[PDB]
Amino acid sequence: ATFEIVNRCSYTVWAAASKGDAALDAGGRQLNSGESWTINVEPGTNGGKIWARTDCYFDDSGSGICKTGDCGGLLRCKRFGRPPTTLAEFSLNQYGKDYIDISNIKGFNVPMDFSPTTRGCRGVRCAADIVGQCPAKLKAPGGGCNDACTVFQTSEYCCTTGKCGPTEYSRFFKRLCPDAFSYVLDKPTTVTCPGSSNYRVTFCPTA
C-alpha cells in the first residue's frame, strides 16, 4: 500500500511511521512546509501508525530529540512516539478489508486528515484547534495537548481494567473532534475500506 504524507503546516514537521516493533518504510523524515513523502507499507500490516513530530533536532547519525512524538531519539522511528501525538492508525488486509482511524487517545499535537486516495470509503479528520483550547491541566509545556491517561495515570483514564467511561477530559477531545477516538472504549470511529486501498495523510489540512 502507498501512503502519501503531506505537510501543509506552515512549520516543519518530522513525520514518523511505525508498527511499534519496527519502522514502516524509512520510519521517519523531515517534511518542510509543503513537502510530500511517499512511503510503501507492506500488505497485511497490523497496528501501523503515522504521526508528526515537532521541534526536532537531529545530528548527522540521525540521533536527537523532538518536543512532541519523540521515538527514543531517532529520526527513523522503530517504535511509537511520546505523547502528545495525534495518530493516524491503520490495519491493512484484515480478512479482505482495511481499517483506518484517527485517535486522540495519546493526545493531540498537529491537526490531521487521513483519507483514501482510492475509491470505496471516506476519510476522517481532526483539524480543530485542540492545542489552543486545551484544558490547563492537559497542556504540555513542549507543545500539544496531553490525554488524561498520560497526565494522571489512573485506571479510569487509562481504562486498565477494561471498564471505564467517558470523562471530562475525554469529552473535551470528543467535542472538538467527534470523528477521532477520545478514550479507549469510545464508540468506534473506525472506517472500513476495501483491502489494499491507498491513502494520504495531511498535516494541517485546513491551516
Author numbering: 1 to 207
Task: Give sentences from the paper.
Serial femtosecond crystallography (SFX) using ultrashort pulses from X-ray free-electron lasers (XFELs) can overcome typical radiation damage to protein crystals via the “diffraction-before-destruction” approach. Here we introduce hydroxyethyl cellulose (cellulose matrix) for serial sample loading. We demonstrate the cellulose matrix as a protein carrier for SFX using small and large sized crystals (1 × 1 × 1 to 20 × 20 × 30 μm). In addition, we demonstrate the successful de novo phasing in SFX by applying praseodymium (Pr)-SAD, single-isomorphous replacement (SIR) and SIR with anomalous scattering (SIRAS) phasing to determine the structure of proteinase K. Furthermore, to reduce background scattering, a novel grease matrix, Super Lube nuclear grade grease (nuclear grease), was introduced in this study.
Using lysozyme (1 × 1 × 1 μm) and thaumatin (2 × 2 × 4 μm) crystals dispersed in a cellulose matrix, we were able to collect 100,000–150,000 images in approximately 60–80 min at a wavelength of 1.24 Å. At a flow rate of 0.43 and 0.47 μl min−1, a total sample volume of about 30–40 μl was used with a crystal number density of 5.8 × 108 crystals ml−1 for lysozyme, and 4.3 × 108 crystals ml−1 for thaumatin. We indexed and integrated 30,000–40,000 images for both the lysozyme (space group P43212) and thaumatin (space group P41212) crystals. The lysozyme and thaumatin crystals yielded data sets at 1.8-Å and 1.55-Å resolution with a completeness of 100% and a CC1/2 of 0.992 and 0.988, respectively. In this study, 16% (w/v) and 22% (w/v) cellulose matrices were used for the small sized lysozyme (1 × 1 × 1 μm) and thaumatin (2 × 2 × 4 μm) crystals, respectively. The cellulose matrix with randomly oriented crystals was extruded through an injector nozzle with an inner diameter (i.d.) of 50 μm.
